[PDB]
């Protein structure tokens, strides 16, 4: 069962299977199950190729998705980086952007601990 | 307890079996103050054990407990430098607490998915003489009689 | 660093507030402010008269301030001269059109704030502090006063090192809130610095 750009969720509930798609979360999954009139609880394996083709129809071109998404986000970064934007400097130096504190607990954004002497 | 004997708490009889040992076992199952959860766990496990085997779950609970009771353990005592593992008997009160605790901590090391499944199955195994609880008891009783050479340090 | 305030301790029983009225969320702030300005200006003008307590009551826009003084003569003045000047000065600050009452104090040596003030006065003129202290405890002790205690803080006699002085008499049981201990604080300012003066008096039981 391939829906988006090549994507094969299997053997699980369709609403949760769609999460395995890049541009789909729980919200967009429940929406595509909603407007396509498919019981969300069915196993992917039990899906009709008619229901499947309808799902591909809706999902493939309603929102920009896996490839175009990854690219558009990357180009969105290079956008604020190419300009002298501050946010761009934070993305350059691999630091938190949202206005967090860096004096401790920057571990997710930056280079898990690299210790020096004292 | 530096001043007094620190008298034992008197538990309330079980709402179902009118039995106190059951209430204590429920208490050891209960976590984060959820006694209703713990009780439903225990009793659903009583259905499991009473169906998969045609005997009264009461007698199996008592027997399973009874087979985990250790009669001897080991305690460190600081003697002339590094201390020693010193065997001695186990208070009946302490046999109680240890056997129930071991039963619960063993049941949760079981592969079974639901709680009452583990509880029932561990109760059955321990009542038949097998199961992890009876192995903690057999290992502790192996700690005594091994360091038996220090039976003069009784204290 | 122990021993919390005795008057603050006893506000419930065997002590009454120096301000007794009622107010809401919108009122209490500036009424308390007004009380503070009152006690301020009175402490300015009446220090020579020996004032101990100023009681501020309010029913509705009326002010029943009662001053407790050792020598009411200084308060009133000759034929009511000063009680005109400063009592009009009072209603100039607060537009309450506020009245005023004067009350004598029998045995100024029995009012803890007054005793503290007298001792601090002696300190600002540089008298021997242990004499001033034991003498004050006699003035208190020689009249009623089932207990009495006096504390003077550091820089005794202008000494380089701060010190703490002493000599209570009778029984001053701060720990029991039964028997109406009185407390008063005074401040002696001198060339060598600042000096705290604490006065405990013990009177009555139940």
């Amino acid at each position: 069962a391939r829906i988006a750009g090549v994507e094969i969720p299997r053997n699980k509930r369709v609403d949760v299977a769609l999460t395995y798609i890049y541009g789909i979360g729980k919200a967009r999954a429940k929406e595509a199950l909603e407007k396509t009139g498919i019981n969300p609880a069915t196993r992917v394996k039990d899906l009709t190729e008619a229901e499947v083709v309808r799902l591909r129809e809706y999902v493939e071109n309603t929102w920009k998705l896996e490839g175009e998404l990854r690219a558009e986000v990357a180009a969105n970064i290079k956008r604020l980086m190419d300009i002298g934007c501050y946010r761009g400097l934070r993305h350059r130096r691999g630091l938190p952007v949202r206005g967090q504190r860096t004096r401790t607990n920057a571990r997710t954004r930056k280079g898990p601990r690299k210790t020096v002497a004292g | 307890a530096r001043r007094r004997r620190a008298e034992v708490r008197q538990l309330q009889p079980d709402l179902v079996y009118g039995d106190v040992l059951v209430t204590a076992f429920i208490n050891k199952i209960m976590r984060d103050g959820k006694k209703n959860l713990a009780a439903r766990i225990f009793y659903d496990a009583c259905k499991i054990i009473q169906e998969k085997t045609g005997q009264e779950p009461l007698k199996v609970f008592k027997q399973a407990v009874e087979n985990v009771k250790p009669r001897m353990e080991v305690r460190s005592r600081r003697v002339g430098g590094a201390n020693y593992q010193v065997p001695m008997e186990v208070s009946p009160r302490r046999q109680q607490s240890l056997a129930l605790r071991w039963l619960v901590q063993a049941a949760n090391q079981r592969p079974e998915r639901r709680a009452a499944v583990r509880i029932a199955h561990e109760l059955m195994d321990a009542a038949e003489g097998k199961g992890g609880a009876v192995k903690k008891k057999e290992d502790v009783e192996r700690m005594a009689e091994a360091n038996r050479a220090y039976a003069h340090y009784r204290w | 660093g122990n021993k919390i305030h005795p008057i603050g301790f006893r506000l419930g029983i065997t002590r009454d507030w120096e301000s007794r009225w009622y107010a809401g969320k919108k009122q209490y702030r500036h009424l308390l402010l007004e009380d503070q300005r009152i006690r301020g200006l009175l402490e300015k003008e009446l220090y020579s008269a020996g004032l101990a307590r100023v009681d501020i009551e309010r029913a509705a826009d009326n002010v029943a301030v009662t001053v407790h003084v050792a020598k009411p003569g200084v308060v009133i003045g000759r034929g009511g001269e000063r009680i005109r000047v400063l009592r009009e000065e009072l209603a100039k600050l607060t537009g309450k059109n506020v009245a005023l009452n004067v009350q004598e104090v029998q045995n100024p040596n029995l009012s803890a704030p007054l005793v503290a003030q007298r001792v601090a006065e002696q300190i600002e003129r540089r008298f021997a502090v242990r004499r001033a202290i034991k003498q004050a405890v006699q003035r208190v002790m020689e009249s009623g006063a089932k207990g009495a205690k006096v504390i003077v803080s550091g820089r005794i006699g202008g000494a380089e090192q701060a010190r703490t002085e002493w000599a209570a008499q009778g029984r001053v049981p701060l720990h029991t809130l039964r028997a109406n201990i009185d407390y008063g604080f005074a401040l002696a300012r001198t060339t060598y610095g600042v000096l705290g003066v604490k006065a405990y008096i013990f009177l009555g039981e139940v």
């Binding site: - | 709402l15 006694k35 209703n36 009780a39 | -």
Partner: protein
């Protein structure tokens, strides 16, 4: 005709009205079990009637408000026992050894400044 007991446990009140009847119990306009039953300790509330074998003698109407349903249950135990004593005072000497007529004075200990929750102290290091 009718007998009454108040009962109280841990910030909760439950007025117990006993009358001779089938044995059916009403709470707050809900069946006894429609209020409880999902709660295992429920039956404990009725332990006063089993000590004197007063099961099928009395119907009861209860008014329970305050606290949580467990303390409510204990309040009901006490109320049933208080009415049960006013009915026949000779039940005192039967109900007393079980202590069903004793009030449980244990209440939530007050939160104290400096501590986290009234006993639990914030942890420290010394280094």
């Amino acid at each position: 005709e009718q007998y009454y007991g108040t009962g109280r446990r841990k910030e909760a009140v439950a007025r117990v009205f006993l009358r001779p009847g089938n044995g059916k119990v009403t709470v707050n306009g809900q069946d006894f079990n429609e209020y409880f039953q999902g709660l295992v300790r429920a039956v404990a509330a009725l332990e006063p009637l089993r000590a004197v074998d007063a099961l099928g003698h009395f119907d009861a109407y209860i008014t329970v408000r305050g606290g949580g349903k467990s303390g409510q249950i204990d309040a009901i135990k006490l109320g049933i026992a208080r009415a049960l004593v006013q009915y026949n005072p000779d039940y005192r000497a039967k109900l007393k050894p079980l202590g069903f007529l004793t009030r449980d004075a244990r209440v939530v200990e007050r939160k104290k400044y400096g501590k986290h929750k009234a006993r639990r102290a914030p942890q420290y290091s010394k280094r």
